[model samples]
Target chain A: EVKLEESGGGLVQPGGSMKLSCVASGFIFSNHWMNWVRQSPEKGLEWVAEIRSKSINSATHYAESVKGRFTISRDDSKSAVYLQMTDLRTEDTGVYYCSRNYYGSTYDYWGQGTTLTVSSASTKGPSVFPLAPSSKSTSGGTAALGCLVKDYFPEPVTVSWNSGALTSGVHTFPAVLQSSGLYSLSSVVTVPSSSLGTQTYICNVNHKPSNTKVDKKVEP
Target chain B: DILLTQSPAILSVSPGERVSFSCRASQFVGSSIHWYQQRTNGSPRLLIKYASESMSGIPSRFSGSGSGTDFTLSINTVESEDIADYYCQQSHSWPFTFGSGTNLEVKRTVAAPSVFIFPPSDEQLKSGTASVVCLLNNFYPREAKVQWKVDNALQSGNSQESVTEQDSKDSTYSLSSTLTLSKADYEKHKVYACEVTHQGLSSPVTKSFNRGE
Candidate 1:
């Protein structure tokens, strides 16, 4: 019955600052801890910071990755968690996420990621292309569909698929930082080969800075 | 921070078999340990929540047990689809860390991938641009990895694209990687090699190509 939602994120130049917020619902903020986690092209999932409240006072901890540059706090009235990071670097470009920590230290619920991009000495918009390829068998069975997003910089792109009711079969791969300093990502979903040419596959790619988005549909 | 180390980095098992994985924490994490299942082409999914408690919708066959610094994630009857990577995470303190990974896979019965590299398309060669495709086919388990090299030196080939497909008829997997080259490297005589590494292979599968051919 718990859900976490995140807000307040966008593009920032080197040395600039940014703040993100996570709002929790269906749970009491005072009874549990809200943790901040981030994902980057170079590093997968990293614990950025966390805040927990006991009675009237709250305690906060920041990971070494955000040691001097980040501050994590909570708003009692709003029942939300906040993260502020200054002196941003290109390395800060990635997705920021928040999760609800249980008493045993497990994060059972998570928020949809917030894409945060930080520019470097050279600032250039990203070039992204989406590909949808289908693999099938002639013997009448299910086939795999792959959706890929290629060659993007500042690495703040998020990919999702609209599989309608067929959600359980979708699989998203980890993002890879290519040798070109750009990022490439892909996801796979399996569907009945009999549905080919009848069922539609939709892939979504979202970039925060320019708000460029691609919601392309392919018939497999 | 609680450090986690997993044993039997690579687990080889067959379907219907029982398998257990252990995660030892540097410090006592108590019941604060969590387990996740990460498929080769999928994101991580919470397999066990709060040590031994099962998450909603998880298979009953998937079970966990442990406390303090030691924990175990055991599968009752392994399924072919269960062959994937497993990770352990600690929620005991700040700087949460995860185990590097332990791969659970089905026993392989087929030979290594058949690998071969060929020159670029005629259009690419005519345009003064050159590329090569490394083809690896007929491998099982879909756990094979590929690497590209030029003149025995690794080429980052960030632009290199790889695709893997599972043949439904035979259930085997195939992979292909295309490495585009710079004009200078393509025009001159250079040795390009592609290596496919898989647990099923006796040794790495290798194929090489030269500018002359």
Candidate 2:
């Protein structure tokens, strides 16, 4: 009849921290081990940490991989277990679950999973500033359009164009990591000159980790 | 650490039949074996503790017994809700392990649940927000999943869900989930949905509605 519920996992910005709480009922928390486990979309279940209490004191243990940034602690008065992680990264995005450890092997009771999404706060979303078209055609007679994207942090953005299919020439140079730890770079795309002026060629920057995207329209 | 191994990966028990599930430990596990029932919806609950002791709130008919290395969890008579996955865990040493798992099925006919979302009363809507309930009724095995969504997005509002209840006559189970949301959110064409997923249904039974008539 034990029930476990997890709370406090959602959107978080990079360089920030996230805290999660697991509330348990139907049993004495001091009698057993409380643990937190997480599973990334591309990876299997990982044991994060656990807390075991005895007498007036308790001990905490973390999985070797998560020992640095993850903290697992318990509060007997509140009948709850808490997990906190600092210095968030894009890879921190995943579903976290709380479990009452049975022996040392499996979870006897589990909480409903919670999803955590971490985004790059330094990465600025593409600005929608209007751009005039240049009546010029590059090699292969396709129109070349460039979009200046700056003020974004981290790297690895998915850039797409709505007005036309992007050619192999589309990409961004290595972004300059600024003093503020943000990213600045230029994105380029090529579209059929025939379809130019008929539709809006918008540049969209996507942060795959948080499922966030920013768009800027350029005409040429 | 003592390792537990379970036999007969699947069990087809008939109601009123005496069933005994066994778990073998690699070494003397003492009295550290525990049994749990894992339902199809993914929640695992402890049913027996210390290999031979009963926990609070569990049926008296459910019992466990074993020696140094062999253990058995026996049910005096199988019940409809007893059809679920079972596992035995050993807590004798560091890094405990569990038996793979045993799936139990009752040789009986069962029906899937039908979920419905009731309209919020005007009193509940008078405020800037309201609490809505979704009802799931007439489901078998007492195992199901209730999901709430606001405008197709996963429900993130304050929510409360009920444990499964059995109907006296049909032996079917029923449950409900209530979610609170702000009315202003639906002013721009918002829809609330309740989805029930069960083993009986190939897909989840989904019901939805807008704010008012």
Candidate 3:
């Protein structure tokens, strides 16, 4: 029943600083260690830092990659762990996850991840497009429709299928950073094959930063 | 950085037998030592903290003693599930370190489970959803771990696992886990994998499924 909630995402300017907080519950805050891990499409998974407390004193360990640039700290009274990072760059944009340490090295409970976007440019909305013609299954009893939303800044975007919201058979992957420094995400919705040709599926992308909405229609 | 050396690299014992191991630190670390238990292919679990303090939900059989450089973890009567690698860590200073770990071996025979991954059913496909199932059978010790992966990436929050049931005839355990996803992911030919871990096996067994293959 361990839970970790991490905050402090959103946009960060170059040479700026940000403090990430991981609120812990359901376990003794001083008994075990907490770790921070970050993931980018390019770097995969990187162990950032770890922190634990002994009585009133605490100890922290940082990976060599982030040493001196990142600081790990905790507040036992509040049952929270914090990570402070300075001198931000676009390469630092990624998803940060906080986890409760199991052994001295492994993680058991993990957070849902906080998306950090480091940019100096203005906000840009996403562009919607059909995933591919081959995404639709031909022989199967179900029809799969997908959309690609790419080149967005300030990561908060909502994707919905058709005019209504369908939650049962939809999968939306996390936004991934591209080599061009933009972000892309893919989503798919499944429907019965019998609905092909007679029904149209639309993917709506709503980007709040740019105050824009885009749609892509798929006729199976 | 304080180095911890755990002694008795391997200890063989029978169920209901009492056993103890030691963790000697390089320097005086006060009572900042902690204990953990790690089973094969499973994540480690903290059992004791601050040298002698017990954690919540831990069994009474497990206990710790001593402080500074000398610490000992004792199990009053080791159960079958207690057969695992025990480790000690010192959190007194920077670069907190862990001991090499002591493997607690139980003198009992075990069986590895047979794992299989099945594709979505036709009814599920007709309903515009896909539910992939991973079935594990004939595992001993009644404990097994299951994980689901999509296209080699770990997926969370979309899986449901059933309670392990023991067969009356052989006392072996069986369990099933299901991963729900959109049929569109299946149509896109995404690979779905099931990984099973049991105490009897040295490594995890994995099975994968893909469309049209």
Candidate 4:
């Protein structure tokens, strides 16, 4: 007969702050640990935070992605747990759910998700920078060169090497959000060690949001 | 990194029997545990996440329950194809650690092969060449390694081995190996032995033949 109900999700402007709440029933709130999980279409379920409020020395854990921005607290008398997020951005738009940890194991009881949306979406283009080619060999006598694209928005960016499409020897990492509410991504391309001093590499980045293309050249 | 101890390193069960594994952590890790199943010759796949939540496409029979320092992974009804190793991992704190795995072995009737070695025939010995045949019969689980030895010295090359499923009701297997030898060696009455290593036996079974006999 244990139940959890979540509320306090609504529209918030970029750079604003908000608080979400979950009220518990049929159980002692202070005796159990509570967790907050958020879901978005792009990134599925993400565990945001967890809080245990049984003792004076209560403990709380937060995901690294939202460590400084999100805070979790609880009130035993109200049988409630709260999640407060600061400096919200468009990337924070998602549905969040509250769950009770059953016997300290899994999230046994989950509250209906509360959806939050960041109003007035904005867009920005990326700035591309080239990293010097490594002097050491990577594999099979090849050197690796990196391209760092930062401070972009809308999440999707295409990168290429030498102004041509590369099918292999190219690795692009997922975009990471910076504290400034901008996204950054990095790509690496491998080339033969023999070509390091003689070859000039070009890194091309296409940011679809602003329909802008940036290119950086690495001189051997 | 917190140490995790998994009890009962190996488990033997028949198909359709319920099975459970235990993982205990050295310190309280809340419910930050996950379970993985690694099939024979396959990669480890995530079966349960955050202690007891089932991942997508995972069988309903596979479940996890527990929190804090103790966790359990349960299989409602064991399946023959479920024979594999299960491991639990904790991610509550830094230096996430994994437990020593529990190997699940499905019970199956096994039969060890009886081996016999035949000496070279007289006509072949007269031709300056001889073939020694090693016959292995009534072994289960198909996989077996065969080695030929002369005077207790390992002999390599000049030998061919083949295996076949026995045409019987027990679903056992049979294997045969032929080792070629020089007639001069056969005339010297050198001892020829066939050694078989199979899962059903704790040690390799050896059978030998000598013209001196």
Candidate number of the best DockQ = 1
**Model 2: which residue pairs collide?**
A122-A153, A123-A152, A123-A153, A124-A152, A133-A220, A152-A183
lDDT of each: 0.69, 0.67, 0.72, 0.72
Using TM-score, give the best candidate's number: 1
A1-220: candidate 3 lDDT, tens digit per residue: 7778988777788878999999989998888888987766575445689876665256777977778889998888898888999988888888888877654634556776777878886577776656422222322465555565657888867788885566545555556555456666656555766877777778888776677787778653
lDDT by residue (A87-116, candidate 4, tens digit) is 888888887889775444545567777767
iRMSD in angstroms, per model: 7.6, 22.3, 12.8, 24.4
Which scores greater on DockQ, model 1 or model 4? 1
Badly placed stretches (over 4 Å) of model 1 are A7-14, A38-46, A76-79, A89-95, A112-150, A156-180, A184-203, A215-220, B28-32, B38-57, B66-69, B80-85, B90-98, B106-139, B143-159, B163-213
TM-score of chain B of 1: 0.65
lDDT of 1 by residue, B1-213 (tens): 667889887887866789999999999987888998866534457789778988888999999999998899999988777777788889777567777678876654675665545555443466564556555555676777888877888777333545443432334566656576666777765787787798787888676766564
**What tier of docking accuracy does candidate 3 attain?**
incorrect
Candidate 2 lDDT (Cα, 0 to 1): 0.67
Compared with the real two-chain complex, what DockQ does model 3 have?
Answer: 0.03
- Against the true chain A, what TM-score does chain A of candidate 3 give? 0.67
The residue-by-residue lDDT of candidate 2 on B24-123, one tens digit each, is 9999888888888866435557789888877778898899999789999988988877877787877776555667677776655677765556544444
How do all the candidates rank in terms of DockQ, highest first?
Answer: 1, 2, 3, 4
Model 4, position A77: C-alpha lDDT score: 88
